[PDB]
Structure formats: C-alpha cells, structure tokens
Amino acid sequence: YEHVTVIPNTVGVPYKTLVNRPGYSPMVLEMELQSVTLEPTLSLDYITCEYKTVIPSPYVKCCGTAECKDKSLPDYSCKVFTGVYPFMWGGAYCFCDAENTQLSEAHVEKSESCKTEFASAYRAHTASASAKLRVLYQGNNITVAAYANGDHAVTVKDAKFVVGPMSSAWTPFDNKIVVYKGDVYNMDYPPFGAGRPGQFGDIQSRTPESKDVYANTQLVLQRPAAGTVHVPYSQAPSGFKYWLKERGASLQHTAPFGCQIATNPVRAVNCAVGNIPISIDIPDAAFTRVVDAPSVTDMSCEVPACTHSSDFGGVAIIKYTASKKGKCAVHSMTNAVTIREADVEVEGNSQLQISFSTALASAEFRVQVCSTQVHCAAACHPPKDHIVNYPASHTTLGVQDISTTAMSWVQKITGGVGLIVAVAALILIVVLCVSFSRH
Amino acid sequence: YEHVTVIPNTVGVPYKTLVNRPGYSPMVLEMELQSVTLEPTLSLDYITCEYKTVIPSPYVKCCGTAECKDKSLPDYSCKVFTGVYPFMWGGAYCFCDAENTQLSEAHVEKSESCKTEFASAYRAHTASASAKLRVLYQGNNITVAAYANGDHAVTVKDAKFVVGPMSSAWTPFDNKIVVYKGDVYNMDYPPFGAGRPGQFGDIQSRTPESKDVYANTQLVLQRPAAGTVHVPYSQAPSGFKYWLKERGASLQHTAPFGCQIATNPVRAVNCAVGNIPISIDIPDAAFTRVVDAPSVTDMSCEVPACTHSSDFGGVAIIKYTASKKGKCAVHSMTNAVTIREADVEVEGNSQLQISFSTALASAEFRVQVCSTQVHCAAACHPPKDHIVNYPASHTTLGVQDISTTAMSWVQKITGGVGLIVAVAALILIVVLCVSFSRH
Ligand SMILES: *[C@@H]1O[C@H](CO)[C@@H](O)[C@H](O)[C@H]1NC(C)=O
Ligand SMILES: *[C@@H]1O[C@H](CO)[C@@H](O)[C@H](O)[C@H]1NC(C)=O
Predict the structure, then answer these.
(1) A432 phi, psi to nearest 5 deg
(2) Smallest CA–CA separation between A323 and chain B, in Å?
(3) Would you call A396 helix, strand, or coil by DSSP?
(4) How far apart are CA B28 and CA B12, in angstroms?
(5) Among residues B134, B194, B192, which one has the least CA distance to residue B163?
(6) CB-based contacts of B272: which residues, under 8 Å, 6+ apart?
(7) Potential cystine with A303: which of A313, A378, A385, B53 (Cβ 3.0-4.6 Å)?
(8) How far does the CA of residue B202 sit from the closest CA of chain A (Å)?
C-alpha cells in the first residue's frame, strides 16, 4: 500500500498521520523531524590572508649613482636618493659627503601563515537538502536518513520511504559568501584582481599554495633619516587582518528562521520553512484485517478537567467495551486537537485515560478508535504561564474558533428585524397593488 | 583611460573597436574570440554498471528437507524443490527416489569492471564561463584568458582587461545528465533506489568503490531439469549494458548552436549566443598626442572594383598627402562595412590600397584615418559561389539596404498626386465658403 502526506517543515514536533485501508485495521504513524540539512554549492572564488613585506638590504653607494631595474614581482617598488651621509657605530660609512647615493626597493609576498589561517570567498548559489526522520513503526522508534529533494528513496524494515522535495526553495545563504575558520558571512567581496587597500580582498590568492598572487598596497618609499642607514617604507596597512576586527555579526544570528550553520562541510540546519511531502509504501504484513482487531462497544467519554496549553494539558477518560484483548489505534480527526498517544491495548468492558493538547477555549471533538467514533465535550481554562521554552506547534488554532457559551450569545445576537421590515414592505406594496399593477 | 564595448558572442570573427581620446591619436583595436568554455556544476547523483550474479553450489539433500534462512543481501532469493533425482557421471547421486530435496539461492553484486567502466549520473544545474581572447596591441597579437562572468580582471602589458558577464544565461546542458567514458546525454534518470529493470539505473551504486548497492532484478528460481544436478536462474537481463546499445545521438550533435562538449572536466565550448561586454583600462603610454601623429591632406578615394562577399572582396585605392612619415590608424564608422587592416604607415604625397568586406549592392561609405574623413562610392557585383565553409559575420546587412540606382526609381515613384487633390479640395471648399461660413 502507498500513502502520501505532507507535514510542516518543523523540528521536534511529533506529527500523527492516519493511514487507513479498507479490509484492515487503520493505523496511525508518528513522524518526527530530527534535523534537516541544506548543503549549498561550493565554487571557491579565491582566498586571502595577511601579507609579508620583503625589503632586502638597501644598496648604498659613494661617488657614483645607482639605477632602478624593473622587477616582475607583485607591487614591486624602488626609489633612489642622493646626498645621504649615513653613520654607523664606528663612524661614517664613507667619505663622499654628498656625491653618494642610496637605492632602495621592496615587494610584498604571501605569508606561510596562510597555509594555516586564511579567509576563503566562495560563490555558492544553489543547495541540496538532507534530513533525518524518526518513525513509530510496529511499536518502536526507527531512524531514517535521506535527501529531502523528492528523489532519494530509502528501504527500512520492508517499507519504502520517499521524502521531499522541499516546498520552499528559500535559503539563508547568498550567491557570494566569505568563510573564516568556523564562521560564515554574507558579504559581496570585491572582484579578483581589484582589491581595495585596507579592505577585504586587499590581497588575492587563487589557492593557499599557488605561488602567483595579486596585490595593491601603494608601496611608496621615502628619503631615509639623515645621518642614519636604514630603509623607510610606506607599506599599506593590511586590510585583511583589520576585517577580522570589524567582522560583525555572524550569519548564525542574522539568518531568518535561525538555520544553524556548520562548516566542513558548510550546512544550514534546523530552520522551519515550508513543508515536506512524504510517500510511504508499506507492505501489507504490518496491515491487520479488521476481523483480527477486537471489536469495540459501549463508548462513553468524560473530561474531569482540561487546560489548553503548549503541553498535553488535556486529560480524557473513556469507558469502552471490547470483544477481546488486543491493540487498537487511536486518533483525532480534527486538526484543532492532537493526541500524544498512538494506540492502546483494550481488554473489554474497562476504561482508559488519554492525554491530549488543544487550543480551543471549549474542546468539542470526536475521537476515532477501532473504527468507531466517540464525542468529547469540555471547557478548558487558561494556564498561568505566558511563555515556555520547549517548542510545541501541535495546538494550532485558526481564525475560526469556538465562542463556547458566548457562541449562543452571538447566535442570539444574530436575530434581526429584517424579516419584519420586509413583511411591512410587502404589505404596503400589495395594499398599493390595488393601484400598482406592474411598474 | 577606460573604454567599454560589447561584441557578438562569436568565434573566429575579428572585431574592430575604435577607442578615441581627445588630445591623442585615436586607436582601433582588433579583438578575436579563440574559444569560450562553459563549465557546469557537478553534483554526482550516482553511478551504475553491469552486475554479476553469484549462485553458489546448490544444497542437495536426501530423505530430509532443507530450509530458507533470510539473507540481508541485495535481491537475495531462495527456493526449494522436492522429488528431484539427480544423476552424475558415476550414477545417481543418492538413493532416496523422491524423499530427497534441493535448496537453491542466489544474489547479485557489483562487478569489479565497474572500477574501470561505468556510467555516471549527475544533476548539474548552473555553469561558469571562461574564454580566450586575441588582441592586436601595439602591432602584435597577444593572448588573454579570463572567466567570462564580469568578475575576473586580468593584467597584461600594463593594461587591465575585464570580460563578461555573458549576456545570455542559456546553456546546452540540463539539470540532469548522464555521462559515459567520453559521451554526455541529456536524459532524466530514474530516482535512486527505484531502478526499473531492463532500463538505465537498473543497478544503483553511490560510488564505484562503495560496497552498498541497490538492485531490482526479479531473481526467480525454477525447478531443475529432471535427472540432472544444476541450478536454473531467472536472472533479469541487465538494462545497463543494453542502454549502451540504444544510447542514441550524443549532445555534441543535438546541442543547439553546436557547443562542442568535452570531458574531464565536462565543458561546452564554441557556441554563439548573445554578446560579451569588455572593459579595457589602457595606460596613456600607448596613447600618442595628436601632434605626434603626422598630418593628412589631399584625400581622394577610388574603387577599381568591388565584390560583396564573405571575404575581403572589396579593394579601395586612396591618394593621400601627409606631413611626415608615421603610423596612422584606419577605420570605417559605418557598421555595414568592415576593414581587414587596422593601421598603416604614411610617408606623404603617396597612395595606398585597402582590402575590405561589405554587403551593400552599392557601397557608399566614409572612412576615417588620421582624424580625417574620405568618401568612397562603388557598385559591387555578386560573386559566383552561393555557400562557403569558413565563417564570416562581419558583413551584416539589416532590413535597411541601398537600392542603389533603383533608389532614385523609388524616389521617383514616391511622387504622388495627393498635393493636387488637396489643392482641388481647398479650392472647392473656399469657392463654397461664400455660403460655407464655419460648419
Ligand atoms: C520513542 O521516543 C519517545 C520519546 O520520548 C520515548 O518516550 C519512547 O520510549 C521511544 N520508544 C518507543 C515509543 O518505542
Ligand atoms: C596576428 O594574426 C594574424 C592572423 O593571420 C597574422 O596574419 C599576423 O601575422 C599575426 N601577428 C600580427 C598581426 O602581428
């Protein structure tokens, strides 16, 4: 047998789905979402890290002049100066008072630290869904894992489960993302080869190991301090290290629906959006012919007390009589109320208690068991607490709601005098019809 | 200086782009598309290959009966039979004439050949673009490679090139694709775990090395032939090997726009769709002040003959006079005609010849050189050939076209008698206005 259902995309909220098959006892299964993972694409746009500035020993000269020869290196720069008269510990370096010259040059390279610490920019666009389910089958909890895209089919305990596809294509991610060691950020990185100094992307590297790099750091030299031998540099401050200082809030806090985000691999998990379709092919072995199930008769219901709450605040006692000892499923056919229990053993002329959750001020509903219906009417009361920690979406109430006793009040209010006014209009128009024929 | 242009997405067709800068001699660059590669996503849905059927030695028994014990193996099957009296070379296996029994069983596993030969199904959805360009710069052809998505920037010979993004998002691929050793097919494979026997996907494996597999082969046993010892099997024929027999046309022939398809990695290349935007930042070093360029004067044009064709069938001779020896660019400002040459050396009061392509029956156009314009009028003739092999899109002609001498004819035809009829109407209405005042 094949059964298809749909459930809200929520985690930790048990769901009852009643599959019925003529000629056999109908059975209701409990399905729970352990977690749902969304794996986005991974197109590594590039990486970046802190840079090291290499400035070899400056070239000094006397009574002669140096010269700049271009170097095919990133952001390589050079300069010359004249008239410098450096002094060392033992005295002047050389005699030429002003005929001397100084040549300096520098460049910037990647740091070995990049091999361990860095920030990587990807252009992830799409994603795939995988999920974990817990199912109450034959009186035991069973775990299943499958891709929640409507394609993956999984066989367990002789039954075939298919999940997905996700109703909503929404994702918390973005086309372009930047990832640190364990943090993710939605942020539009500058295009490769156009890094703006002092900002993210100031140095661009294709891979942590690729020797080729790109840089933009305005490396300008300056005239050295008089009387000293040294190289000054106007090295641009590293925007990469700085961006780590102003990273801002991570996406695990800014993600709508709070989809928890992990790494290695990067996934977004546990966000409630849309719903999921599930198709279950269940072999008939689990199915039991109706004759096998014990009968039921003399059904009475009572509610000693009930309390509409996020928990199972409602308790109902039912008196039942059955043919023989045996298991029997229990369900509520009204979505406004949910029942924690799935089935129960029935011996005969006995009673039982059931714990349920509702949201109506007055709970008036039918309950199905052993292919029989029993009414239940009660007046719940508001609990004391206004907010709770654990989640509970079972007790969902639409705009339609039970006015309870006040229902009668509005039923009494609905009475109007339109009938009498129409009667008066008819009477006047007829008594006029003596003179009013067809106008 | 920054210049932005757009060119049709075509390969092998040179394109002239004239960048002009006041205060310097304008320069026209030739850009050609070597190839454009589209790399689609790669999400390996699964793989498949031929399967091997393992049927160990059947269990024989006499005067007793065997039994089937379930095996947690793919498509494992078993059966028993009674009354079989097998015979071997030396005589009957055993005495029990009919009390004997036979137990048989079999299963199906992956083949070691899968490690070498197989077919892999992917769910590639999106793609990225990379391209190769040839540019005529400073009188030399230079090659550039970059991602054609409007992001990658490439520095060459002191100039910054940016290409893309692709105007059209169209692709020849599809969300779901199946790849053989060197062939690709657009084909919707069945979902994993639901392989239909005798068709592609009949056996499903997550990876070539993963031990776990899924199968669907209706392995039913049969009663062995009387008087013999052997195992019959109703093994399902392998749909995988068969699909190789009816693969059909590959996508390299069915792809619109003929985008050539490769593998390892899978790319679609050389398909003309849409256009490409290109932004070039050119340092002023290449730019030359107008005063540097020699002047030009006494410009005359003549066409000894021309022939509108896919080739450079037009030849034009120009008499020119210049101030001094020097290079000078040449261009045509009308898109209806293209010129093969980019620049030329000019010595002074001399002449030159230029080879060009057109599509107008009568070619009437201006030509720009050394910031000066020269007219050129000629009457081309149709060539003899009706179809050619090499591609040529330069000579593009819109609905607007030169009627040539016949233009005058229609200009003569345009004359109408509406003027005289309006004159007659005015005359009659006025001579009536004696009695017609304002109606
Ligand atoms: C299934 O999970 C519930 C959750 O609390 C647990 O109480 C129960 O013992 C588990 N096993 C069953 C229902 O067989
Ligand atoms: C550039 O390519 C053309 C193509 O044929 C070739 O003729 C020419 O020699 C190449 N080099 C140039 C134009 O410097």
Answers:
(1) -80, -25
(2) 36
(3) coil
(4) 18
(5) B134
(6) B8, B9, B10, B11, B257
(7) A378
(8) 14
* Nearest by Cα to A119 from A269, A235, A245, A237: A245
Indicate whether residue B140 lines ligand 2 (CB < 6 A): yes
CB contact under 8 A, B43 and A125: no
Q: Which tokens sit at B150?
A: 């409007």
Radius of gyration of chain B (CA): 39
Q: What is the CATH number of the domain that holds B354?
A: 2.60.40.350
- Resolution of the experimental model, in Å, one decimal: 3.9
3-class secondary structure per residue, B44-65: EEEEECCEEEECCCCEEECCCC
CA atoms of B417 and B425, how far apart (whole Å) = 13
Which DSSP symbol is given to B238? Answer: P
DSSP helix/strand/coil, A240: helix
Question: Nearest CB to B192: which of A43, A152, A194?
Answer: A152
Q: Which residues of B fall within a CB distance of 8 Å from A213? A: none
| Spatial distance between the Cα atoms of A391 and A272, rounded to a whole number of angstroms | 12
Determine contact, residues A103/A206, Cβ cutoff 8 Å.
Answer: no
B305: number of Cβ within 10 Å: 12
In 3-state terms, what secondary structure has residue B429?
helix
Contact B71, B295 (CB under 8 A): no
Q: What H or E segment, with its residue span, contains residue B253?
A: helix B251-254
**Chain-chain contact of B151 with A41 (C-beta, under 8 angstroms):** no
> Chain B partners of A45 at a C-beta cutoff of 8 Å?
151
- Whole-number Å distance, alpha carbon B141 to ligand 2 midpoint, is 6
User: What spacing in Å lies between the alpha carbon of B13 and ligand 2's midpoint?
Assistant: 14
Contact B120, B178 (CB under 8 A): yes
Task: Find the CB nearest B192 among A126, A153, A191.
Answer: A153
Please tell me the distance from the alpha carbon of residue B332 to that of residue B321, in angstroms, as a whole number: 19
Tokens of A308: 């509409």
Provide the residue range defining the domain that includes B365.
Answer: 290-379
Q: How far is the CA of B229 from the centre of ligand 1 (A)?
A: 52
Say which ligand is closest to the CA of A30. 1
Is B261 within 8 Å of B269 (Cβ atoms)? yes
Collapsed DSSP state (helix, strand, coil) of residue B423: helix
Q: How far is CA B430 from the centre of its chain?
A: 70
Identify whether the C-beta of residue A156 lies closer than 8 Å to the C-beta of residue A220.
Answer: no
Token pair, residue B69, equals 């014990």
- The residue with tokens 């599959």 is A19
* DSSP state for residue A189 in the 8-state scheme: P
Q: Are A70 and A140 in contact (CB under 8 A)?
A: no
* Structural tokens at position A26: 């109908």
Test B153 with A191 for CB contact under 8 angstroms: yes
> Which of A13, A29, A141 maximizes ligand 1 atoms within 8 Å of its Cβ, making it the mutation to test the pocket?
A141
**Any residues with CB less than 8 A from the CB of A203 and at least 6 apart, and which?**
A48, A49, A50, A51, A108, A110, A195, A213, A214, A215, A238, A240
**CA–CA separation, B121 vs B98, rounded Å?**
52
* Chain-chain contact of A153 with B125 (C-beta, under 8 angstroms): no
Give the span between the Cα atoms of B71 and B54, in whole angstroms: 13
**Contact call for residues B278 and B5 (beta carbons, < 8 A):** yes
